[model samples]
Target: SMEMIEKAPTDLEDRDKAPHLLLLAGIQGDEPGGFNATNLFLMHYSVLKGLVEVVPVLNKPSMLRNHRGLYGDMNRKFAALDKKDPEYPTIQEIKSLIAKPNIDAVLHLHDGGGYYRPVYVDAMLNPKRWGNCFIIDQDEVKGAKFPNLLAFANNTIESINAHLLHPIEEYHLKNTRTAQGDTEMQKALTFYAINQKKSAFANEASKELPLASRVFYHLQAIEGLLNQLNIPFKRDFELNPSSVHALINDKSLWAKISSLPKIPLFNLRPRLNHFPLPHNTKIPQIPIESNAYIVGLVKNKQEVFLKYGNKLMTRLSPFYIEFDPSLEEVKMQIDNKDQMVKIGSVVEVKESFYIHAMDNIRANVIGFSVSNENKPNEAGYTIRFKDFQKRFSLDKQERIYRIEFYKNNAFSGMILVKFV
Candidate 1:
């Protein structure tokens, strides 16, 4: 999706036009550092000035498959490609972006092999290696918008090395000199940008390092570029490897159940046996507040899986489950105090809560055993934690219980009651 961070000034005579920065990642699906770093930037930063466009995952299908390319390497298809190829659409779209008049510079992210050095020192440090470096299509494009390509790269590399996780992880600049006739480089995405008179640079993180470190270096280059472009922005977290790892691996990378919109991640944790969910339920969609994606839902044997992008965020397994539709606002007695809560809201049960019945509504406490046949339908019932402590434990430890409401056997919403 394209976002215009700052609008061009109508008073062109008074204000200089802010150049648009186009950022692209995931050109090679297997190289995830570029994509993840770009994604993190989108998640945490809000653009205050300057026009910035970000394509966090340019090759979605390939990324989903975790391959270099599903059809062919997208980066190589920019110069010339088969019209019938699956990636043709994306190639055309990105080329159009590069050709746009408003765009000033383009930055493409990638993860390559080994650290790059101008002179060959060892297997990991050689002119052939593309990793841990800023790549320019040429030494300089005379008369082009940003002519000093080498200087631009050197400046960014210096900044990245300053905050290196280790001295071995330092960065360098690599000029491909594609204009002078590098067969393969001629078709690269950055080359296309340079040919269009747009300042284009490729940022590569060494595949030798962990995914998080790769992302950290990509971020460093990105922030440096943003500063060079005079764009004002703020990041939610510090630029560090640990932060990148947490942002990608922790609960921060999430999806929300649309049916229970208010709860950020209603089903974010591990699989809960006999988990309660509405059958034929509404598919979970990424929250509007986030740029996350729901890649697809898969069925593995008797279990069903909900995938959030490439990662398996959560699942429903072990037993069959059903849901109930009841009142949006549920009235309950929590620790002897009566309170009403809406769907997607969490009510803490320091001890326990008694779910009160409303007209045509019944409460079903998941993982708790009660005689539904003898229990009063649409009648108030208390669920004390101590009473079912031994019987309802999952993994031999106390677990949270879900209180679902149903009306006429139809699922409505749910509220989580945590036993503290």
Candidate 2:
């Protein structure tokens, strides 16, 4: 099947802005959690500011069909595609976009099994032999701390670690793969993997939490990351860790014990969900990377959840997007402008173009936005793709002027762009 894709900023002004950021998630089908995170970010686009471009849903067909998304290793094929392949659409499209000149940063997402914790792997396939360009883990050796991304990962680890402490038994697996030579298992090892049961628990005698409770806390970790990043997030699975099923004799015992009192993740004002009264006033404190208290702890995790699928619910039960209004907002901005030469209004100007990002370089504008200003003289607004050339001065080209909008003037919240 053909790849399904969409582009935003139908206006030249919006398209030709600066600081382009690329985000991709849900490449795998059957990954409900990944889809849920991505949709949540899309719904809250107000958090994403100026000149941000997102491909929220890349493997729509595979996801809907409950397939693995790609026929084989889609990631390995990123750099090795030609004209004669069946999955060429996906490989080709992504390759083209990543190569585009003005692109700044690209963030990819995925989900893992219960034995694992959510972690990030930077551009691992590429090595230090390369210039340490856009890849993540692969470029870590060459001043690629990826401080922000690492910060996000650390938060996720803490969240998952908290839940893993109370219920399940811990087991450690030093080997990257299992008894079977599963390629996916190998890949998971290459990327960062977490073992909640073993990895998160304190010494040998920590209080054992239930499986469902652990899953709920893991979801909380994901939510914290998404809230901080302001970028779209995605997941591909439910929080159910099947490994527990493999170890137990009477599986129903595991289920019955797990169904007991659910712990409220926190107590501060009871979260936005408004958990309940008689809520545990004490703290549901989890260990943190430091004593500094980076993220506040929950007072009562046992507080009942508000709704089954509520976004506020912990991240363990991630689902796909119910509706994406960001695209609609983009359309609205581009279609309602009243002036031909309007600098920032969407529909105020016309003439849109779709440009391919041929390679990793500065983005340049090769199109024009037609307007009625100076009608007799044909004075049109200049059109260019917002890219690093302008913001970072990475090249010899003069950077285009840009306007960044944060939720707070102080630069927090969804980021939006208005080009001059």
Candidate 3:
């Protein structure tokens, strides 16, 4: 369920003729700073000269759960993978993205445990650590577009270092010497990209730092690397801790579920139950923000999840039924004032509400029962909040309940009535 976003200058006559760099992150889910920065980059980085293809969240499910990898370490799967392996298809996708003719180099991102330095400087900042550095798999990749790997990394490192917020928050060149048969190093994304004859490098921000600070570091490196290639660009936020931090926390994404009203993803009501979604909807549609992924769980009674980066916004409990596409509008009465209401709308009921009877369509007022017990349809009933059972209400506050309309036993749509 991964998608690549392509961004470039508007003046380009042919995008193929321009220099391009493939920006990747979210290879590891626990390393959210990487993907967060990647997503932020998509939001900001305005391309000028060359094309940039970005995969904001490569391992989405793992990212949603905040795990390194659900099946296994996806980064290591690139070198050799089995057809039966879960990462096989994802790896294939990554390979195909790299194989694109215009991709000149690859810049992968990560959030390693701590700072990395050549000398034994303690556990967190030492030879064994993998954080706060520009990592390359080899000194040179034969026939690669940017063959001198060390110099390439050095150029970006120097750029990144110039804007360091602190002395310790600096970048160093870490050549894994992957070609010398380092088993783990060889089985990585950079190694795979290098083998394919592309200049590949990675920037690791330390997990010890705050999320915003880590993201800041990652963004700095990304900008630096892009600048090195002369892929002229501009970022919306200043390249500093405070501005980058604010940019990362911007909760402005709006999500859409198949014909459902788009809802602002942040601060959504948790466990919003009886959400109207067709039972057949295997995967919910992605949100307006390309960085977000919408997914559903059949095991949890068709529970849909809205995931943005490393966190879950809300869990939607669904009411599974057949949908009637023909139904569009309905006649309803709120406080004895007749109104033509659109289907899939939320009506504020100050006192009472009623759904006018339709010859073909039947309305079922969830949580409200009236004198006509045997009949399935609850239309024509003037119902107040006092007449309903609170348990069946859609929202936790016992205010919002759904009036579901059905046609030929298929669910047409619903109108949510919220008692103000």
> How do the residues 1-420 of candidate 3 rate in per-residue lDDT, one tens digit apiece?
677988777877646555799999988878888898888888777888779999987887687677899889998887778999987998999999987778999999999987998998898889888889999987888898778888878988998899887899888999889889899988888888888899898999989899888998888888888777777888776788888776665555655556554454565667777666776655533323333432222223356666677666678776677777788888988998999988867788999988888999988787887656644688888889899888776545677677878787577887778799
List ranges where model 1 is wrong by over 4 Å: 1-17, 120-123, 142-144, 246-253, 261-269, 272-310, 318-327, 358-361, 372-379, 387-399, 407-410
Task: Supply the global lDDT for candidate 2.
Answer: 0.31
**lDDT tens digits, residue span 1-420, model 2:** 222232334454554443444445446654434444344334323322323444544554455344565466554454445667666776667656554555444445444443321233243211211111111232111222123443444554454444443333222212222224544433321222111110111111111234333333324443444444443433333343443212111111100001111222222122222111222222222221211101122222343322111122222211111111111111112223422221122121133222222122112221122433321111122333432234322112322122211121121111112232
State the C-alpha lDDT per candidate: 0.70, 0.31, 0.79
Q: Per-prediction count of colliding residue pairs? A: 8, 55, 0
Compare the candidates by lDDT and give the number of the best one. Answer: 3
Q: Which candidate, 1 or 2, has the higher TM-score?
A: 1
- Cα lDDT tens digits, model 1, 174-256, are 78889788989998899988888888999999999898999899999998887777666688898788888887765434333
